[PDB]
């Protein structure tokens, strides 16, 4: 009950850390598209 929340906080911490790592991958992905949009259209949109 209490230790549920303690355990839940740790699970939320672990998950939040994986989220930052995944998010970094996808931002780099989008930057690649942005880079070519700039090369072709002179736009980042």
């Amino acid at each position: 009950r209490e230790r549920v929340e303690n355990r839940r906080a740790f699970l939320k911490l672990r998950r939040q850390q994986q989220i930052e790592r995944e998010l970094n991958g996808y931002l780099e992905w989008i930057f690649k598209a942005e880079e070519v949009m700039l090369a072709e259209e002179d736009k980042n949109a």
Partner: protein, 289 residues
Amino acid sequence: EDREAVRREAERQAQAQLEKAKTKPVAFAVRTNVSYSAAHEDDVPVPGMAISFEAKDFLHVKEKFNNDWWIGRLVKEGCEIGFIPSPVKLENMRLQHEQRAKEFKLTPPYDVVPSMRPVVLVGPSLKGYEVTDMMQKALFDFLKHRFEGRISITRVTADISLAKRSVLNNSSLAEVQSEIERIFELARTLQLVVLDADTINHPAQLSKTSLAPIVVYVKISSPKVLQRLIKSRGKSQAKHLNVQMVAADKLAQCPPELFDVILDENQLEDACEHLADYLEAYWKATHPP
């Protein structure tokens, strides 16, 4: 003795046909609705040269031999030209199987499809919004280079989800049907065909058409990750956060069998290599030595 000479003559003529057919272009392709095993076959023009297949396989048809048999090849790496049972032959087998089945007390077999299955991208959310448009653009850009000289990438603005019998036999439908023909024609070259289809956000949308797409799911596994990507594109995009979250959740509810390729890697290079590996295999399947 006067049975070998008759068989030998008939099979020499059949064999000469197969060889002549090798250098002909694909007349048309079909997707199979039934399976067929040439085990305990006995009437194939050349023994051992009948082509077996599972349902939902793809065949390239080069020629007709007689009313029981066409000439062509299974679209599978390594597979060579041989005899393909005509639909009337397969029908005689479906009723034969039926008579047997009702002894216990005790759909057309082929659909005509493009010679190259067109590649369609869906996800991670709705097209017309930045996160989806840009992630898919990176993939299109990669393909133009990796398969340069071997690929056709064309935009399709028409709503090709309308191209089914319940609509056609009862976006303007003229335009839609025109686009379907354009896509069949593009695939005749046997180049890889890639569609940037504006209106297609879900595999169900093309399942009742004759396009038989290769459906590639660009999947962001994490909802929180998608939410933060959308917000990273600024106020205008973030204002439409909910509708994009809904659409992505909808896609993620789909069984994986609805897709041919699921790109859930979060590194662009890994997604690209996963996709190229699939398409390289398909290229080999459609182009034998």
